[PDB]
């Protein structure tokens, strides 16, 4: 499971992961404190422990790891992926792989979050060396976006490699 | 370049 949008992903307790947050679809550091899918065991014992779905078709519950103020906040498998740790290099940017990566949306020169996108045009000059992506926030997509910051593009982590 | 920071919320 490598580049290519490799569709991945399971966590666990203290499993660092990345999170979207559902407001401006940004992905940032999260530290997991709970993996569980809410059956209160299959008809409701006051206990709420077992799960009804596999560790990776479960539910995730964040404490974020930068952000420790907005405390433990739930996401889904797909809207969660694991610290994304390793580097996409210039030359390994696919055109359609699904990326989190350094954009700001408030100012696209700038560095924010790591906003999720897929690779949608590569270019170089003598001066400058860039990517275009299609960029997705949690309401709205911004089509063929300049990426500056080219270092430190993340891909979709293993489940437990 | 290799370096990872945030920035705000709209949360």
Known sequence: ?161 | ARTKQTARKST
Not at chain 1, 92 to 103: A, F, K, P
Request: proline letters at 4%.
């Open chain 1, 1 to 161: 499971g490598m580049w290519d949008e490799t569709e991945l992903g399971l966590y666990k307790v203290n499993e660092y992961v990345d999170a979207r947050d559902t407001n401006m679809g940004a992905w940032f550091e999260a530290q997991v404190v709970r993996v569980t899918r809410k059956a209160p065991s299959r008809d409701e014992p006051c206990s709420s422990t077992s799960r009804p779905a596999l560790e990776e078709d479960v539910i995730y519950h964040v404490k974020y790891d930068d952000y420790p103020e907005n405390g433990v906040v739930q996401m889904n498998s797909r809207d969660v992926r694991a610290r994304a740790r390793t580097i996409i290099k210039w030359q390994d940017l696919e055109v359609g792989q699904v990326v989190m990566l350094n954009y700001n949306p408030d100012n696209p020169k700038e560095r924010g979050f790591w906003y999720d996108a897929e690779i949608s045009r590569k270019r170089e000059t003598r001066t400058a060396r860039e990517l275009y992506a299609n960029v997705v926030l949690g309401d709205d997509s911004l089509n063929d976006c300049r990426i500056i910051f080219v270092d430190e593009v993340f891909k979709i982590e293993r489940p437990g490699e």
